[PDB]
Design a binder for these strands. Structure first.
Lengths: 77, 127
DNA sequence: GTCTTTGTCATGCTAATGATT
DNA sequence: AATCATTAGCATGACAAAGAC
């Protein structure tokens, strides 16, 4: 029921890559997958990132259509 | 007056909502908008002031000043330690001598301007 | 609920600038 | 050329995925 934030480029990409890295290394903690995905994403070229950048753009636009009155309201400590 | 106020307020609540919808359907971050104002007028704005414009948390005077630049954006898109030292001088001399100011600037590797401004900001902090 | 990452947006504090002297 | 109010950004932190713990 609560509206989540839309998924930025890295996080879109990181979904499919997380699944493959879990398959390749089935003991690896999600914490460690994350460090490795960070390192891999920093290395990707601008051309390699573009499909993921456009998917995040597309999901932000849809987020607005789905949730016209949405405001990001983070909880302060 | 009050009539000019209500009208200007409704105008901006309305433009800010257009600005947000347009930057989203065009795939721009707040950051991108600030940076791209910089490219098209040579005048960068930070992600922060774009967050505050869209949430109506800037002053109505501030919104009015920035709204033209942003309307042009919409158009084109469619086609410590140093502080410690300064505190201790403030305590001894709240309004400092011009000579004292220069001394502490070269002493801490700052220019005068920063130093004199620091003291003014600190004076205003008494409430 | 916590490890973990990048990117995006929100906010608290204060440096910097504008307005008016 | 010098105060006081106001504008503005830097640093920071939340939160989106995943699921083992």
């Amino acid at each position: 029921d609560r509206v989540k934030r839309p998924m930025n480029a890295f996080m879109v990409w990181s979904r499919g890559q997380r699944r493959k890295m879990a398959q390749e290394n089935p003991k690896m903690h999600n914490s460690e997958i994350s460090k490795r995905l960070g390192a891999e994403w920093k290395l990707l070229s601008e051309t390699e990132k573009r499909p993921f950048i456009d998917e995040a753009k597309r999901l932000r636009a849809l987020h607005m259509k789905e949730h016209p009155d949405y405001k990001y309201r983070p909880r302060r400590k | 007056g009050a009539m000019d106020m209500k009208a200007l307020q409704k105008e901006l609540e309305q433009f800010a909502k257009l600005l947000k919808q347009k930057r989203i359907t065009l795939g721009y971050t707040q950051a991108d908008v600030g940076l791209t104002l910089g490219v098209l007028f040579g005048k960068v704005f930070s992600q922060t002031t774009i967050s505050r414009f869209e949430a109506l948390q800037l002053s109505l005077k501030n919104m009015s000043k920035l709204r033209p630049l942003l309307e042009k954006w919409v158009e084109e898109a469619d086609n410590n330690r140093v502080r410690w030292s300064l505190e201790t001088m403030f305590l001894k001399s709240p309004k400092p001598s011009l000579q004292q100011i220069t001394h502490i600037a070269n002493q801490l590797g700052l220019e005068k301007d920063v130093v004199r401004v620091w003291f003014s900001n600190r004076r205003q902090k008494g409430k």
